[PDB]
């Protein structure tokens, strides 16, 4: 055989609809390797997962496992260049990312199918021998301190690290996962310790026996084998014992507790946690997936339905949680409402009444069998995933499951084990419960404070009298076991291609009532179909009042159909219903077997909807706080939000939405629904297994239902208006300035507006964005260390495009403006002095990126729908533009920069958005920035838009 290969798993059980070939193999140094052959993919990928996470970090240096992760992308032995890895992938249409979990560390990347070997070699140099520079450390420690700083005021990370801190100080579960400058630079210097620690950690835990490699490409299995053996059989083996944690962070002094936590946002979530043993080895039966399916069920007579009718909660989740090798968690989280906050004890009481209901009726074999079929069907008709994320997740689960049963690891279930189900369910008792209640009402009534995040909370102990009530609980009659799933598809027949088949979605129904687009699937051949519907109505966004009544309408509708839709949700038939600036948006995606049944029930309940006052007040209240929760979002998101407000003709801010919300009464909404459904216009897209007559019948069903119940009469052609983008003048600089009231960091967005989305203007922008794509990430973040979040690319809106820069940091926005302007000059100098080859590199890179065909049906449906909502209908856009792209020269880009993006451009449409930090003032080497003209301050948006023209709309094809 082969000396470098220990064993070969030539037979990997794959999906029958999967045409890709798989070959698993175990190397001599104990590296589990899986190879995927896909000769038709446009982008190859590879991923390596080390079984060492941030739980094995030294007690002195916390967040070291995550820190070393960032140090690997900064120069190696064979490739001493600091940004060799990053630059190489960008020049060949690729990307890369990494993340450190509890006991995991994943590194993945995708790239063009031609330069896989060259990229795989550079990736292999990260584990053999990494050079940790003395200055790269001093800069990356700021990058780690900044990526943690952006998560300080985030309720998710605050509650995640709190359940760690409230646990056992001895157990590694309480250790800091992320880590900041204090743990990486400050503390080691205060005790005289760091680069030597990076070397010792990489040489003690980053061993071959704890690594898993998964490579995907166009190459054959033998060529991929000879390449992995070439690069990964040289990895040093040390046989490091896999860190196991048989101990549990929770114990006698950690159970039966009350953690009253004060959140940043105005939310009220209750967290019930059950400490359970590691269920990873029971994957063949998966008792946690069983009990999670019953408890978190949203169907009639479930735990959610009972807690809804009492007017206590809105959502219920659900299932088991992940911890580490040795322990897991079985959580039942639930949101506290007006009455739910006052009846928390009664909510948990009902929970145990449902748990007692499961213990009473005992383990059901027909339920497990139903889960077996649902999972088996979902595995067979499984969508082809994108190479990058696919190899990333497989490499992570390669350590747990055998080589031949990886693709079928989390999908197929074998032998019914009720005793294992009974074992987990036994751990679900009031004697083993951990309650964590979060509310804003606990403001100023807390005693303790978290260390790293500074979270205000108070720890209490639930009285045994309450425990007795939960133990001695009578079975509730409302709690019923879910019946047989009547939405399980039985017909998977793929309808043969018709004689009038079309490569692109065509228009088959153009009337005053509705416009219909139909594209029968001819690429993926599954038994699924995507049904998107866009309802146009003037009374949806005419004023903040109707804007609120429209949102409350669809939220009440989704609330009323929550039970009926969930039964089809488990059967792979989902639906999405959200309101847009033009009206409504319905999107039913899933199996087309019982799909018209779901759609009919949606439309029929949509036309004739009777509002419940109790549910009206609850949703209205939750929507009010949601508009106040927007107050605490990250700066860069506010910059993008404000820019959307500025450039758009009509837009309503959050503050005047809640002001109008205070005038929304129940009788007003009842009279608003028929008025809203009075006149409509439906632009749809039916893309799937259905035929033309089937599509027409579906459209006919929707129209005939709306006409019968809601009396819908068609709109006018001149009544269908699309909003425009504000036309900026030449050499005009505009700045909007507001403050982020929560985060102590500042965000900024610089938008250079270009001209009207034409083939010429499109490729002049995207190619330029391609050239400056990687240098932006390298100069602004890797070299100058402005902030963790550095982004640059094209911005398309209302048929108008341009170049946008998005940076979040703690530095002055005006300083960031200068550094970007200085970046534009040194990049214009770069393009001017590069060879012809250095230009064809970026052309070919963008070309492959644009020609990356969709992976599944929902991906292709998203592209077509985007070309429809933009009302351009340019389905052949990618082919025409790339053809024009390869015919471009460098002189055209220089002219494009001098005319549109130069510091003294004759047509420079530059608008900026400054988002300051909380306590930052308002009034006030390297490449030096040019002198910038005096900008204009935007204080009132109405007076701003009234003083500027409006762009025309892009005419369809």
């Amino acid at each position, epitope marked *: 055989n082969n000396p470098a290969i220990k064993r070969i798993g030539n037979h990997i059980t794959k999906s029958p609809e999967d045409k890709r070939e798989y070959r698993g193999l175990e190397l001599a140094n104990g590296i589990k390797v899986l190879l995927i052959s896909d000769p038709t993919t446009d982008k190859s990928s590879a991923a390596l997962d080390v079984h060492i996470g941030s739980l094995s970090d030294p007690p002195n240096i916390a967040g070291l496992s995550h820190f070393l992760q960032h140090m690997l992308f900064l120069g190696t032995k064979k490739y001493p260049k600091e940004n060799e890895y990053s630059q190489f992938l960008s020049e060949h249409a690729g990307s890369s990312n990494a993340f450190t979990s509890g006991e995991h560390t994943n590194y993945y990347f995708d790239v063009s199918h031609e330069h896989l070997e060259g990229a795989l070699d550079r990736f292999a140099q990260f584990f053999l021998s990494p050079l940790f520079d003395e200055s790269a450390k001093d800069r990356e420690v700021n990058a780690v301190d900044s990526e943690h700083e952006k998560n300080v005021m985030n309720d998710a990370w605050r509650l995640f690290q709190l359940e760690k801190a409230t646990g056992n100080p001895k157990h590694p579960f309480s250790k800091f996962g992320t880590g900041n400058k204090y743990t990486l630079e400050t503390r080691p210097n205060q005790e005289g310790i760091v680069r030597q620690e990076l070397l010792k950690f990489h040489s003690a835990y980053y061993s071959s026996n704890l690594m898993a490699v998964v490579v995907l490409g166009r190459e054959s299995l033998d060529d991929l084998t000879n390449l992995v053996v070439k690069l990964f059989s040289e990895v040093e083996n040390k046989n490091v014992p896999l860190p196991e944690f048989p101990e549990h962070p929770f114990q006698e002094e950690h159970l039966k507790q009350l953690y009253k936590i004060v959140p940043i946002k105005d939310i009220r979530n209750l967290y019930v946690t059950f400490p359970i043993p590691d269920l990873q*080895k029971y994957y063949k039966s998966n008792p946690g997936h069983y009990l999670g399916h019953l408890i978190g069920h949203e169907g009639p007579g479930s735990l959610l339905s009972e807690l809804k009718s009492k007017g206590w909660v809105n959502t219920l989740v659900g299932g088991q949680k992940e911890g580490a090798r040795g322990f897991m968690f079985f959580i039942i989280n639930v949101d506290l409402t007006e009455e739910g906050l006052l009846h928390v004890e009664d909510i948990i009481l009902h929970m145990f009444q449902y748990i007692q209901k499961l213990r009473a009726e*005992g*383990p059901q074999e027909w339920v497990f069998q139903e889960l077996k079929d649902l999972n088996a069907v979902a595995f067979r008709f499984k969508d082809k995933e994108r190479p990058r994320g696919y190899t990333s997740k497989i490499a992570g689960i390669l350590h747990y499951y055998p080589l031949e049963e990886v693709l079928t690891a989390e999908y197929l279930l074998e032998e019914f*084990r009720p*005793d*294992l189900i*009974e074992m987990v369910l036994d751990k679900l008792r009031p004697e083993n419960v951990r309650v964590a209640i979060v509310s804003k009402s606990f403001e100023g009534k807390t005693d303790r404070t978290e260390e790293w995040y500074g979270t205000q909370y108070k720890q209490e102990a639930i009285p045994d009298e309450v425990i007795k009530k939960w133990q001695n609980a009578d079975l509730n009659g409302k709690f019923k076991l879910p019946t047989k799933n009547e939405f399980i598809p039985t017909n998977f027949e793929i309808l043969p291609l018709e004689k009038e088949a079309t490569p692109y979605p065509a228009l088959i129904k153009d009337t005053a009532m509705s416009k219909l687009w139909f594209k029968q699937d001819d690429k993926f051949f599954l038994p699924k179909a995507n049904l998107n519907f866009e309802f146009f109505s003037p009374f949806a966004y005419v004023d903040p009042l109707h804007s609120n009544m429209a949102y409350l309408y669809l939220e009440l509708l989704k609330d009323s159909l929550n039970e009926y839709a969930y039964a089809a949700e488990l059967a792979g038939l989902s639906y999405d219903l959200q309101n847009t600036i033009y009206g409504m948006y319905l999107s039913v995606k899933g199996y087309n077997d019982k799909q018209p049944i779901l759609l009919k029930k949606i439309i029929e309940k949509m036309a004739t909807f009777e509002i419940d006052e109790k549910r009206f007040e609850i949703i209205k209240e939750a929507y009010m706080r949601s508009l106040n929760n927007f107050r605490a979002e990250q700066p860069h998101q506010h910059a993008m939000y404000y820019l959307r407000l500025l450039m758009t003709e009509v837009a309503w801010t959050k503050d005047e939405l809640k002001e109008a919300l205070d005038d929304v009464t129940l009788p007003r909404l009842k009279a608003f629904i028929p008025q809203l459904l009075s006149r409509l216009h439906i632009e749809a897209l039916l893309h799937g297994n259905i035929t033309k007559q089937a599509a027409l019948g579906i459209m006919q069903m929707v129209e005939d239902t709306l006409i019968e119940h809601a009396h819908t009469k068609p709109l006018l052609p001149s009544q269908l208006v699309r909003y425009r983008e504000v036309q900026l003048p030449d050499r005009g600089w505009f700045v909007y300035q507001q403050r982020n009231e929560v985060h102590n960091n500042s965000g900024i967005e610089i938008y250079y507006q270009t001209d009207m989305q034409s083939t010429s203007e499109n490729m002049f922008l995207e190619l330029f964005a391609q050239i400056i794509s990687e240098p932006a990430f390298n100069t602004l973040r890797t070299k100058e260390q402005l902030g963790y979040i550095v982004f640059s690319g094209p911005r398309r809106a209302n048929g108008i495009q341009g170049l946008r820069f998005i940076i979040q940091s703690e530095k002055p926005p005006h300083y960031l403006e200068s550094r970007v302007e200085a970046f534009l000059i040194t990049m214009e100098k770069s393009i001017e002095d590069m060879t012809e080859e250095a230009f064809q590199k970026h052309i070919q890179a963008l070309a492959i990126r644009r020609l990356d065909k969709p992976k599944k049906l929902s991906a292709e449906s998203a592209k077509y729908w985007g070309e429809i909502i933009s009302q351009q209908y340019n389905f052949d856009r990618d082919n025409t533009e790339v053809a024009y792209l390869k015919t471009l020269t460098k002189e055209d880009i220089i002219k494009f920069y001098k005319e549109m993006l130069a510091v003294d451009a004759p047509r420079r449409h530059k608008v900026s958005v400054h988002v300051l930090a909380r306590e930052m003032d308002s009034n006030p080497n390297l490449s030096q920035a040019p002198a910038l003209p005096q900008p204009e301050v935007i204080q009132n948006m109405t007076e701003f838009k009234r003083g500027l023209p409006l762009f025309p709309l892009v005419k369809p094809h």
Partner: antibody
Amino acid sequence: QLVESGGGLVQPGRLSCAASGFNVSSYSIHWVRQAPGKGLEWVASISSYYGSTSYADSVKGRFTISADTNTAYLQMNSLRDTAVYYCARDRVMYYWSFSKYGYPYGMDYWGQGTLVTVSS
Amino acid sequence: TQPSSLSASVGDRVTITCSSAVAWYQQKPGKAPKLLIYSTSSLYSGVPSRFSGSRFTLTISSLQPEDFATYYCQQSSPSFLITFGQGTKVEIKR
């Protein structure tokens, strides 16, 4: 496979089964005796994982079952009771000792047995 | 809880009678008892398709000379208790 030992001469008034091919830490080892000229009769079984020991209504107090991480044992002090002792193992893994119902998963592998007679 | 003697010739249909979902075992005279059926109805690997289970009963399709032995049952009651049966011996009637 299972390797039994310890049975033989005993005056009125330990057994060792060394497991091979698997680990005892993830399986339940059972002991079954059979009186010469009669049928089978279960005496005591142990689950090392969940740490629970079970005994019959005719041997409890006298007998004692144990194991080690891979070999299992059975300490019998007061004898009378003369039979052939076999040892078997559940086919499935991690069978929960505590139960309110009955789930008899078959005992796939056995041992030929070791004879032990008690007589004055 | 299981007769103790059945007289049936070769090639005949045998029906041996006997918590929940009992199991079935076979012990030939001399050596260790082997498993044939673990849940109510389940054929263990290597076991002939002549054997089959149903409700607490064991059936043999075509009685072979190699099937002449003493069959036992196994009922794993709760609290980790395992109880066998009286054991039925299969004889020939010639």
